[PDB]
Amino acid sequence: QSVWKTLNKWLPPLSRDKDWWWKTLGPQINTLLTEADYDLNERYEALLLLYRWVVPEMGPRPRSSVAPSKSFMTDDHSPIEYSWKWISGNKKPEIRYAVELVSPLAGSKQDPFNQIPTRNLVYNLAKIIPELDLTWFEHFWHELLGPGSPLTKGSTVFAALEMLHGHLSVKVYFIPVETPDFSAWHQIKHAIEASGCPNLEALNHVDAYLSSHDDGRQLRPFMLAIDLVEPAASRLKIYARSNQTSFRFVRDVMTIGGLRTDLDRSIEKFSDLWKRALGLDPDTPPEDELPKVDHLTSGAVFNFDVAPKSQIPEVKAYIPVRHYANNDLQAALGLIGYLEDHGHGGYSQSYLRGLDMLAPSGQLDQATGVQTYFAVACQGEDLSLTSYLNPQFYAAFQ
Numbered sequence: 001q002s003v004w005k006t007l008n009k010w011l012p013p014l015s016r017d018k019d020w021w022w023k024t025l026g027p028q029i030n031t032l033l034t035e036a037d038y039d040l041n042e043r044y045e046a047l048l049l050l051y052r053w054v055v056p057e058m059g060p061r062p063r064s065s066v067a068p069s070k071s072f073m074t075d076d077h078s079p080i081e082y083s084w085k086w087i088s089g090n091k092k093p094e095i096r097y098a099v100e101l102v103s104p105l106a107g108s109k110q111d112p113f114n115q116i117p118t119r120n121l122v123y124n125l126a127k128i129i130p131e132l133d134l135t136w137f138e139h140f141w142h143e144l145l146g147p148g149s150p151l152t153k154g155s156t157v158f159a160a161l162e163m164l165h166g167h168l169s170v171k172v173y174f175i176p177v178e179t180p181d182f183s184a185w186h187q188i189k190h191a192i193e194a195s196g197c198p199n200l201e202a203l204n205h206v207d208a209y210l211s212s213h214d215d216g217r218q219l220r221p222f223m224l225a226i227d228l229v230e231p232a233a234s235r236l237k238i239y240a241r242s243n244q245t246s247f248r249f250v251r252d253v254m255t256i257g258g259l260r261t262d263l264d265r266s267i268e269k270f271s272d273l274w275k276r277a278l279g280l281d282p283d284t285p286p287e288d289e290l291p292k293v294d295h296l297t298s299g300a301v302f303n304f305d306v307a308p309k310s311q312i313p314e315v316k317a318y319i320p321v322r323h324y325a326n327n328d329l330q331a332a333l334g335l336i337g338y339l340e341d342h343g344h345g346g347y348s349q350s351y352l353r354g355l356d357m358l359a360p361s362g363q364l365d366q367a368t369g370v371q372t373y374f375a376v377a378c379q380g381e382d383l384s385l386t387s388y389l390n391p392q393f394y395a396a397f398q
Protein backbone atom coordinates (compact mmCIF):
# COMPACT_ATOMS: atom_id res chain seq x y z
CA GLN A 1 0.00 0.00 0.00
CA SER A 2 1.09 3.58 -0.59
CA VAL A 3 1.62 6.28 2.00
CA TRP A 4 -1.56 8.05 0.92
CA LYS A 5 -3.63 4.88 1.29
CA THR A 6 -2.30 4.36 4.83
CA LEU A 7 -2.95 7.96 5.86
CA ASN A 8 -6.38 8.00 4.19
CA LYS A 9 -7.25 4.78 6.01
CA TRP A 10 -6.42 6.20 9.42
CA LEU A 11 -6.72 10.00 9.35
CA PRO A 12 -10.13 11.47 10.35
CA PRO A 13 -12.58 11.83 7.46
CA LEU A 14 -13.02 15.18 5.74
CA SER A 15 -16.02 17.05 4.38
CA ARG A 16 -16.89 16.63 0.71
CA ASP A 17 -14.75 19.46 -0.73
CA LYS A 18 -11.76 18.85 1.55
CA ASP A 19 -11.92 15.10 0.93
CA TRP A 20 -11.97 15.64 -2.84
CA TRP A 21 -8.83 17.75 -2.59
CA TRP A 22 -7.21 15.18 -0.29
CA LYS A 23 -7.97 12.23 -2.58
CA THR A 24 -6.78 14.24 -5.60
CA LEU A 25 -3.63 16.00 -4.36
CA GLY A 26 -2.49 13.23 -2.01
CA PRO A 27 -2.04 10.57 -4.69
CA GLN A 28 -0.45 13.07 -7.09
CA ILE A 29 2.16 14.32 -4.63
CA ASN A 30 2.81 10.81 -3.30
CA THR A 31 3.27 9.40 -6.81
CA LEU A 32 5.68 12.21 -7.71
CA LEU A 33 7.70 11.66 -4.52
CA THR A 34 7.77 7.88 -5.06
CA GLU A 35 8.98 8.16 -8.65
CA ALA A 36 11.69 10.53 -7.37
CA ASP A 37 12.80 7.94 -4.73
CA TYR A 38 12.07 10.00 -1.62
CA ASP A 39 12.44 8.33 1.77
CA LEU A 40 9.25 6.98 3.31
CA ASN A 41 9.24 9.43 6.23
CA GLU A 42 9.43 12.38 3.84
CA ARG A 43 6.40 11.10 1.94
CA TYR A 44 4.54 10.76 5.24
CA GLU A 45 5.56 14.28 6.32
CA ALA A 46 4.60 15.74 2.94
CA LEU A 47 1.15 14.19 2.98
CA LEU A 48 0.63 15.11 6.66
CA LEU A 49 1.45 18.76 5.89
CA LEU A 50 -0.88 18.55 2.89
CA TYR A 51 -3.62 17.13 5.09
CA ARG A 52 -3.35 19.71 7.84
CA TRP A 53 -2.49 23.03 6.14
CA VAL A 54 -3.23 22.87 2.39
CA VAL A 55 -6.35 20.72 1.85
CA PRO A 56 -8.60 22.59 4.36
CA GLU A 57 -7.96 25.88 2.49
CA MET A 58 -8.28 24.73 -1.14
CA GLY A 59 -11.91 25.86 -1.43
CA PRO A 60 -14.73 24.08 -3.26
CA ARG A 61 -14.39 20.99 -5.41
CA PRO A 62 -14.03 21.42 -9.15
CA ARG A 63 -17.47 20.54 -10.45
CA SER A 64 -17.11 21.66 -14.08
CA SER A 65 -14.60 22.99 -16.58
CA VAL A 66 -15.46 26.51 -15.33
CA ALA A 67 -12.91 27.62 -12.75
CA PRO A 68 -14.15 29.43 -9.61
CA SER A 69 -11.57 32.19 -10.17
CA LYS A 70 -9.12 33.56 -12.74
CA SER A 71 -6.15 32.38 -10.68
CA PHE A 72 -2.74 33.21 -12.19
CA MET A 73 -1.17 29.92 -11.04
CA THR A 74 -2.00 28.14 -14.32
CA ASP A 75 -3.69 28.85 -17.64
CA ASP A 76 -6.84 26.86 -16.79
CA HIS A 77 -6.68 28.47 -13.31
CA SER A 78 -5.76 25.31 -11.42
CA PRO A 79 -4.40 26.55 -8.06
CA ILE A 80 -1.56 23.98 -7.91
CA GLU A 81 1.60 23.67 -10.00
CA TYR A 82 4.09 20.86 -9.44
CA SER A 83 7.72 21.00 -10.46
CA TRP A 84 10.37 18.36 -11.03
CA LYS A 85 13.98 19.56 -10.90
CA TRP A 86 16.56 17.39 -12.66
CA ILE A 87 19.79 16.97 -10.70
CA SER A 88 23.05 16.08 -12.43
CA GLY A 89 25.30 13.23 -11.36
CA ASN A 90 22.56 10.56 -11.30
CA LYS A 91 21.08 12.22 -8.21
CA LYS A 92 17.41 12.11 -7.30
CA PRO A 93 15.06 14.77 -8.71
CA GLU A 94 13.73 17.45 -6.39
CA ILE A 95 9.95 17.83 -6.10
CA ARG A 96 8.26 21.13 -5.33
CA TYR A 97 4.75 22.38 -5.57
CA ALA A 98 3.18 25.82 -5.61
CA VAL A 99 -0.23 26.49 -4.13
CA GLU A 100 -2.50 29.52 -3.91
CA LEU A 101 -4.88 28.90 -1.03
CA VAL A 102 -8.32 30.54 -1.02
CA SER A 103 -11.00 31.61 1.46
CA PRO A 104 -14.66 32.66 1.18
CA LEU A 105 -13.46 36.28 1.57
CA ALA A 106 -11.60 36.38 -1.76
CA GLY A 107 -12.88 39.28 -3.83
CA SER A 108 -14.63 40.91 -0.87
CA LYS A 109 -13.44 44.12 0.76
CA GLN A 110 -11.88 42.02 3.53
CA ASP A 111 -9.54 40.25 1.06
CA PRO A 112 -10.02 41.56 -2.51
CA PHE A 113 -6.90 39.88 -3.91
CA ASN A 114 -6.84 36.59 -1.93
CA GLN A 115 -3.80 37.17 0.26
CA ILE A 116 -4.92 36.03 3.73
CA PRO A 117 -4.69 32.22 3.18
CA THR A 118 -1.12 32.36 1.81
CA ARG A 119 -0.07 34.50 4.78
CA ASN A 120 -1.72 32.05 7.17
CA LEU A 121 0.11 29.15 5.50
CA VAL A 122 3.47 30.94 5.80
CA TYR A 123 2.91 31.60 9.51
CA ASN A 124 1.87 28.00 10.24
CA LEU A 125 4.95 26.72 8.42
CA ALA A 126 7.05 29.14 10.47
CA LYS A 127 5.54 27.59 13.59
CA ILE A 128 6.68 24.12 12.50
CA ILE A 129 9.99 24.93 10.67
CA PRO A 130 12.19 27.12 12.92
CA GLU A 131 14.76 27.84 10.16
CA LEU A 132 12.23 29.96 8.24
CA ASP A 133 12.79 33.71 8.35
CA LEU A 134 9.89 36.12 7.81
CA THR A 135 11.84 39.40 7.74
CA TRP A 136 11.91 39.77 3.96
CA PHE A 137 8.50 38.12 3.73
CA GLU A 138 6.95 40.87 5.87
CA HIS A 139 8.93 43.62 4.14
CA PHE A 140 7.97 42.68 0.60
CA TRP A 141 4.42 41.84 1.69
CA HIS A 142 3.81 45.25 3.18
CA GLU A 143 5.50 47.11 0.32
CA LEU A 144 3.75 45.27 -2.52
CA LEU A 145 0.48 43.98 -1.07
CA GLY A 146 -0.43 45.65 2.22
CA PRO A 147 -2.13 48.85 3.33
CA GLY A 148 -1.21 51.83 1.18
CA SER A 149 -0.11 49.74 -1.80
CA PRO A 150 -1.82 49.88 -5.23
CA LEU A 151 -5.41 45.77 -13.41
CA THR A 152 -4.66 42.31 -11.99
CA LYS A 153 -3.08 39.16 -13.38
CA GLY A 154 -5.65 37.07 -11.47
CA SER A 155 -3.59 36.53 -8.30
CA THR A 156 -1.29 38.61 -6.14
CA VAL A 157 0.51 36.03 -3.97
CA PHE A 158 1.20 32.32 -3.81
CA ALA A 159 3.56 29.99 -1.95
CA ALA A 160 5.78 27.07 -2.86
CA LEU A 161 7.13 24.13 -0.87
CA GLU A 162 10.45 22.52 -1.85
CA MET A 163 11.03 18.99 -0.55
CA LEU A 164 14.84 19.08 -0.60
CA HIS A 165 15.52 15.50 0.56
CA GLY A 166 15.92 16.02 4.28
CA HIS A 167 14.40 19.44 4.91
CA LEU A 168 11.65 21.73 3.69
CA SER A 169 12.15 25.12 2.03
CA VAL A 170 9.47 27.77 1.43
CA LYS A 171 9.28 30.28 -1.44
CA VAL A 172 6.87 33.21 -1.71
CA TYR A 173 5.67 34.91 -4.91
CA PHE A 174 4.21 38.43 -5.08
CA ILE A 175 2.26 39.45 -8.18
CA PRO A 176 1.95 43.25 -7.94
CA VAL A 177 -1.29 44.90 -9.01
CA GLU A 178 -0.52 47.53 -11.65
CA THR A 179 -1.93 51.07 -11.77
CA PRO A 180 -1.31 53.82 -14.37
CA ASP A 181 1.33 55.38 -12.08
CA PHE A 182 2.70 52.19 -10.45
CA SER A 183 3.88 49.41 -12.74
CA ALA A 184 4.89 46.02 -11.37
CA TRP A 185 8.52 46.78 -12.17
CA HIS A 186 8.21 50.11 -10.38
CA GLN A 187 6.82 48.50 -7.22
CA ILE A 188 9.31 45.61 -7.21
CA LYS A 189 12.31 47.92 -7.74
CA HIS A 190 11.28 50.33 -4.99
CA ALA A 191 10.62 47.45 -2.58
CA ILE A 192 14.02 45.88 -3.25
CA GLU A 193 15.59 49.32 -2.76
CA ALA A 194 13.84 49.59 0.61
CA SER A 195 14.73 46.00 1.60
CA GLY A 196 18.13 46.92 3.08
CA CYS A 197 20.33 44.94 0.70
CA PRO A 198 24.11 45.42 1.06
CA ASN A 199 24.65 45.91 -2.67
CA LEU A 200 22.16 46.70 -5.43
CA GLU A 201 24.56 46.24 -8.36
CA ALA A 202 22.70 43.30 -9.90
CA LEU A 203 19.43 45.19 -9.49
CA ASN A 204 20.95 48.20 -11.28
CA HIS A 205 22.28 45.96 -14.06
CA VAL A 206 18.77 44.58 -14.60
CA ASP A 207 17.31 48.10 -14.45
CA ALA A 208 19.75 49.34 -17.10
CA TYR A 209 19.03 46.35 -19.33
CA LEU A 210 15.26 46.81 -19.05
CA SER A 211 15.42 50.58 -19.54
CA SER A 212 18.15 51.01 -22.17
CA HIS A 213 18.77 47.77 -24.06
CA ASP A 214 16.73 47.33 -27.22
CA ASP A 215 15.83 43.74 -26.28
CA GLY A 216 15.46 44.41 -22.55
CA ARG A 217 12.95 47.17 -23.25
CA GLN A 218 10.67 44.43 -24.61
CA LEU A 219 10.42 42.72 -21.19
CA ARG A 220 7.59 43.43 -18.74
CA PRO A 221 8.42 42.54 -15.11
CA PHE A 222 5.42 41.10 -13.29
CA MET A 223 6.41 38.93 -10.33
CA LEU A 224 8.89 38.75 -7.46
CA ALA A 225 9.99 35.58 -5.68
CA ILE A 226 11.91 35.21 -2.42
CA ASP A 227 13.09 32.36 -0.19
CA LEU A 228 11.91 32.27 3.43
CA VAL A 229 15.44 32.10 4.80
CA GLU A 230 17.78 34.75 6.18
CA PRO A 231 17.63 37.72 3.76
CA ALA A 232 21.40 37.52 3.22
CA ALA A 233 20.85 33.96 1.92
CA SER A 234 17.63 34.55 0.00
CA ARG A 235 17.36 34.99 -3.75
CA LEU A 236 15.57 37.94 -5.36
CA LYS A 237 13.91 36.68 -8.55
CA ILE A 238 12.27 39.26 -10.84
CA TYR A 239 10.13 37.57 -13.52
CA ALA A 240 9.58 39.23 -16.90
CA ARG A 241 7.63 38.29 -20.04
CA SER A 242 8.03 39.41 -23.66
CA ASN A 243 6.07 39.06 -26.86
CA GLN A 244 9.40 38.08 -28.46
CA THR A 245 10.13 34.39 -28.98
CA SER A 246 13.20 34.25 -31.22
CA PHE A 247 16.07 32.28 -29.78
CA ARG A 248 18.34 35.23 -30.59
CA PHE A 249 16.18 37.22 -28.16
CA VAL A 250 16.29 34.41 -25.59
CA ARG A 251 20.10 34.19 -25.85
CA ASP A 252 20.48 37.95 -25.49
CA VAL A 253 18.27 37.92 -22.39
CA MET A 254 20.30 35.00 -20.99
CA THR A 255 23.49 37.04 -21.41
CA ILE A 256 21.79 40.27 -20.24
CA GLY A 257 22.77 41.94 -23.50
CA GLY A 258 26.26 40.43 -23.50
CA LEU A 259 27.00 41.33 -19.86
CA ARG A 260 27.56 37.68 -18.96
CA THR A 261 30.31 36.02 -20.97
CA ASP A 262 31.72 32.48 -20.85
CA LEU A 263 28.25 31.03 -21.51
CA ASP A 264 28.58 30.02 -25.17
CA ARG A 265 28.71 26.25 -24.54
CA SER A 266 25.71 26.50 -22.23
CA ILE A 267 23.75 28.51 -24.80
CA GLU A 268 24.64 26.06 -27.59
CA LYS A 269 23.18 23.24 -25.48
CA PHE A 270 20.20 25.50 -24.71
CA SER A 271 19.55 26.09 -28.43
CA ASP A 272 19.55 22.34 -28.99
CA LEU A 273 17.11 21.71 -26.13
CA TRP A 274 14.88 24.60 -27.24
CA LYS A 275 14.45 23.23 -30.75
CA ARG A 276 14.00 19.70 -29.38
CA ALA A 277 11.35 20.48 -26.79
CA LEU A 278 9.37 22.82 -29.03
CA GLY A 279 9.43 20.38 -31.94
CA LEU A 280 11.16 22.85 -34.25
CA ASP A 281 13.28 21.99 -37.25
CA PRO A 282 16.96 21.60 -36.27
CA ASP A 283 17.84 24.24 -38.90
CA THR A 284 15.48 26.90 -37.50
CA PRO A 285 17.28 30.27 -37.71
CA PRO A 286 17.80 31.85 -34.28
CA GLU A 287 16.31 35.04 -35.77
CA ASP A 288 12.87 33.52 -36.46
CA GLU A 289 9.90 34.09 -34.17
CA LEU A 290 7.74 31.19 -33.07
CA PRO A 291 4.26 31.14 -34.64
CA LYS A 292 2.05 33.64 -32.85
CA VAL A 293 0.12 32.57 -29.76
CA ASP A 294 -1.92 35.37 -28.18
CA HIS A 295 -2.31 34.55 -24.50
CA LEU A 296 -1.94 36.29 -21.14
CA THR A 297 1.13 34.09 -20.59
CA SER A 298 2.47 33.61 -24.13
CA GLY A 299 5.83 35.00 -25.25
CA ALA A 300 9.19 34.25 -23.68
CA VAL A 301 9.46 34.34 -19.88
CA PHE A 302 12.57 34.79 -17.75
CA ASN A 303 13.56 35.49 -14.19
CA PHE A 304 16.55 37.56 -13.06
CA ASP A 305 18.09 36.75 -9.69
CA VAL A 306 19.41 40.05 -8.31
CA ALA A 307 20.40 38.57 -4.97
CA PRO A 308 23.22 40.72 -3.53
CA LYS A 309 25.32 37.56 -3.27
CA SER A 310 26.82 38.41 -6.67
CA GLN A 311 27.34 41.62 -8.62
CA ILE A 312 26.13 40.19 -11.96
CA PRO A 313 22.50 38.97 -11.98
CA GLU A 314 21.67 35.42 -13.00
CA VAL A 315 19.08 34.55 -15.63
CA LYS A 316 16.71 31.61 -15.98
CA ALA A 317 14.60 31.06 -19.10
CA TYR A 318 11.29 29.19 -19.22
CA ILE A 319 10.43 27.37 -22.45
CA PRO A 320 6.60 27.66 -22.72
CA VAL A 321 5.84 24.13 -23.82
CA ARG A 322 2.06 24.46 -23.44
CA HIS A 323 1.92 27.34 -25.93
CA TYR A 324 4.57 26.40 -28.49
CA ALA A 325 5.02 22.60 -28.55
CA ASN A 326 2.92 20.12 -30.47
CA ASN A 327 1.98 17.86 -27.53
CA ASP A 328 3.16 16.91 -24.07
CA LEU A 329 4.54 13.52 -25.12
CA GLN A 330 6.60 15.02 -27.94
CA ALA A 331 7.93 17.73 -25.61
CA ALA A 332 8.76 15.22 -22.87
CA LEU A 333 10.55 12.92 -25.30
CA GLY A 334 12.55 15.88 -26.60
CA LEU A 335 13.58 16.92 -23.09
CA ILE A 336 14.46 13.32 -22.24
CA GLY A 337 16.47 12.96 -25.44
CA TYR A 338 18.55 15.96 -24.43
CA LEU A 339 18.97 14.63 -20.88
CA GLU A 340 20.05 11.17 -22.03
CA ASP A 341 22.38 12.71 -24.61
CA HIS A 342 24.15 14.50 -21.76
CA GLY A 343 24.04 11.67 -19.21
CA HIS A 344 21.36 13.09 -16.89
CA GLY A 345 18.38 10.90 -17.76
CA GLY A 346 18.36 8.38 -14.92
CA TYR A 347 14.78 9.32 -13.94
CA SER A 348 13.24 9.58 -17.42
CA GLN A 349 10.78 6.69 -17.09
CA SER A 350 9.83 7.93 -13.62
CA TYR A 351 9.14 11.40 -15.05
CA LEU A 352 7.02 9.81 -17.78
CA ARG A 353 5.01 7.84 -15.22
CA GLY A 354 4.40 11.12 -13.41
CA LEU A 355 3.19 12.69 -16.65
CA ASP A 356 0.89 9.75 -17.34
CA MET A 357 -0.54 10.13 -13.82
CA LEU A 358 -1.12 13.89 -14.16
CA ALA A 359 -2.29 13.86 -17.75
CA PRO A 360 -5.96 13.98 -18.75
CA SER A 361 -7.13 10.54 -19.82
CA GLY A 362 -5.64 10.14 -23.30
CA GLN A 363 -4.27 13.61 -24.06
CA LEU A 364 -0.48 13.30 -23.63
CA ASP A 365 0.11 12.67 -27.35
CA GLN A 366 -2.74 14.87 -28.65
CA ALA A 367 -2.52 18.09 -26.63
CA THR A 368 -0.35 20.34 -24.48
CA GLY A 369 -1.10 21.62 -21.00
CA VAL A 370 0.43 19.11 -18.59
CA GLN A 371 3.94 20.55 -18.91
CA THR A 372 3.72 24.32 -18.55
CA TYR A 373 7.43 25.25 -18.69
CA PHE A 374 10.86 23.74 -19.13
CA ALA A 375 13.15 25.99 -17.08
CA VAL A 376 16.76 26.39 -18.19
CA ALA A 377 19.68 27.83 -16.24
CA CYS A 378 23.28 28.07 -17.43
CA GLN A 379 25.64 26.49 -14.88
CA GLY A 380 29.13 26.82 -16.36
CA GLU A 381 29.09 24.51 -19.39
CA ASP A 382 25.94 22.61 -18.36
CA LEU A 383 22.21 23.24 -18.10
CA SER A 384 20.07 23.06 -14.97
CA LEU A 385 16.60 21.94 -16.03
CA THR A 386 13.22 21.97 -14.28
CA SER A 387 9.86 20.70 -15.56
CA TYR A 388 6.72 22.51 -14.40
CA LEU A 389 3.48 20.52 -14.37
CA ASN A 390 -0.19 21.57 -14.33
CA PRO A 391 -2.76 19.02 -13.10
CA GLN A 392 -5.43 20.82 -15.23
CA PHE A 393 -8.36 20.33 -12.85
CA TYR A 394 -10.71 22.47 -14.95
CA ALA A 395 -9.33 22.10 -18.50
CA ALA A 396 -9.72 18.36 -18.00
CA PHE A 397 -12.68 17.81 -15.66
CA GLN A 398 -13.39 14.17 -14.82
Ligand SMILES: CC(C)=CCSP(=O)(O)OP(=O)(O)O
Nearest residue numbers: 081083098160171173225386
Ligand atom coordinates in the same frame (compact mmCIF):
# COMPACT_ATOMS: atom_id res chain seq x y z
C1 LIG B 1 5.75 29.46 -9.14
C2 LIG B 1 6.47 28.22 -9.62
C3 LIG B 1 5.85 26.84 -9.41
C4 LIG B 1 7.64 28.31 -10.20
C5 LIG B 1 8.36 29.64 -10.45
S1 LIG B 1 10.07 29.25 -10.92
P1 LIG B 1 11.03 28.34 -9.26
O1 LIG B 1 11.04 29.32 -8.11
O2 LIG B 1 10.24 27.11 -8.86
O3 LIG B 1 12.58 27.89 -9.61
P2 LIG B 1 13.68 27.47 -8.46
O4 LIG B 1 12.96 27.13 -7.18
O5 LIG B 1 14.62 28.63 -8.22
O6 LIG B 1 14.49 26.27 -8.91
Ligand SMILES: N[C@@H](Cc1ccc(O)cc1)C(=O)O
Nearest residue numbers: 072073074075081297373388
Ligand atom coordinates in the same frame (compact mmCIF):
# COMPACT_ATOMS: atom_id res chain seq x y z
N1 LIG C 1 1.20 31.25 -14.33
C1 LIG C 1 1.94 32.47 -14.51
C2 LIG C 1 2.92 32.66 -13.35
C3 LIG C 1 4.08 31.65 -13.35
C4 LIG C 1 5.27 31.95 -13.99
C5 LIG C 1 6.31 31.04 -13.99
C6 LIG C 1 6.15 29.82 -13.35
O1 LIG C 1 7.20 28.88 -13.34
C7 LIG C 1 4.96 29.52 -12.71
C8 LIG C 1 3.92 30.43 -12.71
C9 LIG C 1 2.70 32.42 -15.84
O2 LIG C 1 2.75 31.36 -16.51
O3 LIG C 1 3.28 33.46 -16.27
